[PDB]
């Protein structure tokens, strides 16, 4: 009947592509050749219609040697299994005998430049450099201790049986190789001769080898002291920078991601995504937003305002009148859009430049916020760690560096803000700025690495906002419509003024008919404000 035709037409509208429909029809045709059962048929149809409950429900009502795993495969039946002598009953009844996996790769593969920073390679090289010298020194010291023990033993019996004493391959130790390895390392090619001498006549041979081993141990110890002195101020210069895996990458991806075109295309991708979904006719309301962000502090809002005004007050290409205009726009209008002067929403119909400014401000506020929570977390962690370590009995429960005091930790953020300001002047070199930021804020310091460029971008946005007549017309229209009360207000009264709101919409359509227009919703809740941006 026509119901099946409607079903096929709607799977047509929701699949968007002929070939995937073709695979669907191959599925049902393989079913029609009696090669597929009903349960199997609904199991193959699931990938196609697994996201449309109505489609799946209607379709269901309409219907009414071997190898396993992925890395295990079997041994031959007529394979001579390697015999084992220690097989008990549990060994036969438990151990695997038919299935085998194979290592497709090998350890220590091409991983040097895969995901490690160049400053981790220096630390690793230092680590193996230390390991070589320490392992040889410890082998030497272990042989020294064993030979000292055997000499102490031989010192205690009668002389007439000293010549009768002999030593085996272990050279008095618990291993047959370690002592010989150390003696070989010490003596080079003449190791067999001295080994034979100490095995045949230990009494006259152990003291001299002790003397040589002790002398080499002392010389190696002083060499190790110098080598360790060199080894420091290399861990210091590389540890924190190796813990930071994103700084070099973050710099470039951020200096690119903050351009106007990137911000535009980020929202344009969502626009075409939702347009394609609408073309599909999928179950999504035609009032949902496109991006959401959140501001969770007003103090950070005034801090950001202070930062942008602090930059713009030191700018030569902008006059006093325009400085005043930017001051009014930032410290009066932006709070008003944020309702700084529940269920309270504000609507703002924005052009391209306003969206660029305001997204950049959101990013700045979020980064300042992340640094702020990081500082609070460091303060709390330091306090709780001090409280925990104060009451600690260590083993009874049966140089270094001076950590900054609490006052410095709580003044980190004011110092951080002053340092960002100093970077804005240029009075501080960015390299020392990065080093200081990392040394305070560990692995989360990279968030504040490109603050200055973001701030100048916002300054350019503000200057262009003042300079272009479209922005002044937009803000004047916003003020005029707010005077009537249609633009923004109480959530309940929306239906009272929605039509009036539509009128505002109409004016936007007749003010930037040749330009992109965004709808921005600022909704206040529990002290935070969620921003909500979509295109039209």
């Amino acid at each position: 009947t026509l119901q099946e035709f409607s079903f096929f037409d709607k799977v047509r509208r929701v699949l968007k592509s002929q070939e995937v429909y073709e695979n669907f029809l191959r599925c049902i045709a393989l079913f029609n050749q009696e090669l597929v059962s009903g349960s199997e048929l609904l199991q193959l149809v699931s990938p196609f219609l697994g996201k449309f409950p109505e489609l799946f429900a209607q379709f269901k009502s309409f219907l009414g040697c071997k190898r396993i795993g992925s890395s295990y495969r079997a041994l031959p039946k007529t394979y001579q299994q390697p015999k084992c002598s220690g097989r008990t009953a549990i060994c036969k009844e438990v151990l695997n005998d038919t299935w085998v996996s194979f290592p497709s790769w090998s350890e220590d593969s091409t991983f040097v430049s895969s995901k490690k920073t160049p400053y981790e390679e220096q630390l690793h090289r230092c680590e193996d450099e230390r390991f070589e010298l320490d392992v040889v020194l410890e082998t030497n010291l272990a042989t020294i201790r064993v030979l000292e023990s055997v000499q102490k033993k031989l010192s205690r019996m009668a002389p007439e049986d000293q010549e009768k004493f002999r030593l085996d391959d272990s050279l008095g130790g618990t291993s047959e190789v370690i002592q010989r390895r150390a003696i070989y390392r010490i003596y080079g090619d003449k190791a067999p001769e001295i080994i034979e001498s100490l095995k045949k006549n230990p009494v006259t041979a152990v003291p001299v080898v002790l003397k040589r081993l002790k002398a080499k141990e002392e010389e190696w110890r002083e060499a190790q002291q110098g080598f360790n002195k060199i080894w420091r101020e290399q861990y210091e210069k590389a540890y924190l920078k190796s813990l930071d895996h994103q700084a070099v990458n973050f710099k470039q991806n951020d200096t690119k991601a903050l351009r106007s075109k990137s911000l535009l295309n980020e929202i344009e991708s969502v626009y075409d995504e939702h347009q394609e979904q609408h073309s599909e006719g999928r179950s999504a309301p035609s009032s949902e937003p496109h991006l959401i962000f959140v501001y969770e502090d007003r103090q950070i809002l005034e801090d950001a305002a202070a930062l942008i005004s602090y930059y713009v007050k030191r700018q030569p290409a902008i006059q006093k009148e325009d400085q005043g205009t930017i001051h009014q726009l930032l410290h009066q209008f932006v709070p008003s859009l944020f309702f700084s002067q529940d269920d309270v929403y504000s609507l703002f119909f924005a052009n391209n430049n306003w969206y660029f400014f305001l997204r950049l401000h959101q990013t700045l506020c979020s980064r300042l916020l992340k640094i702020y929570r990081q500082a609070q977390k460091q303060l709390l962690e330091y306090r709780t760690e001090k409280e925990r370590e104060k009451l600690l009995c260590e083993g009874r429960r049966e140089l270094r560096l001076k950590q900054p005091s609490e006052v410095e930790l709580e003044e980190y953020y004011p110092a951080f803000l002053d340092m960002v300001r100093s970077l804005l002047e240029g009075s501080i070199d960015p390299t020392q700025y990065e080093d200081t930021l990392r040394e305070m804020f560990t692995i989360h310091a990279y968030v504040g690495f490109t603050m200055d460029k973001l701030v100048q971008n916002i300054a350019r946005q503000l200057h262009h906002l003042v300079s272009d007549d479209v922005c002044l017309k937009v803000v004047e229209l916003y003020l005029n419509e707010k005077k009537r009360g249609a633009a923004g207000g109480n959530l309940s009264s929306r239906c009272v003024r929605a039509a009036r709101e539509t009128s505002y919409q109409w004016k936007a359509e007749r003010c930037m008919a040749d330009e992109n227009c965004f709808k921005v919703m600022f909704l206040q809740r529990k002290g935070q404000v969620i921003m909500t941006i979509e295109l039209l």
Partner: protein
């Protein structure tokens, strides 16, 4: 000049894609299959005097299985197999031990290699007819003789020994 050859792909797939080697002493070695050929086909004609050629050409296949196997008949993964065969049983019949799957490959190769020998028209016609008959009988009982179910896999030791 082959009929119903796709079987080869299976061989290829299990031998250089699935990594599942062939049995060393599987069964029915190639000379034995050739002799079964002579016995079955000599019982076809009423008066086959030209059997004076049948065994001959069948014998020919054996000698063409002798020098040519291993050079341009096996694969890179099959190289350790032939290395073990030639290191363990050199004095044993070389044209033996290996199974039927390898045999057909020869007829795959000769179709190109024969392009380098200028025989006479009658001789080449007779040879082409005989290989056509050979692969037609192999097509008649491919299922009975060819069986990929007994294809064991290479442990990583064989993986190292191969490449």
């Amino acid at each position: 000049p082959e009929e119903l050859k796709p079987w080869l792909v299976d061989d290829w797939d299990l031998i250089t894609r699935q990594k599942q080697l062939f049995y060393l002493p599987a069964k029915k070695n190639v000379d034995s299959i050739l002799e079964d050929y002579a016995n079955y086909k000599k019982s076809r004609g009423n008066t086959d005097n030209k059997e004076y050629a049948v065994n001959e050409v069948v014998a020919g296949i054996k000698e063409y299985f002798n020098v040519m196997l291993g050079t341009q008949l096996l694969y890179k993964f099959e190289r350790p197999q032939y290395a073990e065969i030639l290191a363990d049983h050199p004095d044993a019949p070389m044209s033996q031990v290996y199974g039927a799957p390898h045999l057909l490959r020869l007829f795959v190769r000769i179709g190109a290699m024969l392009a380098y020998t200028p025989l006479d028209e009658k001789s080449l016609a007779l040879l082409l007819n005989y290989l056509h008959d050979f692969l037609k009988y192999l097509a008649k009982n491919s299922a009975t003789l060819f069986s990929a179910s007994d294809y064991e896999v290479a442990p990583p030791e064989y993986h190292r020994k191969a490449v």
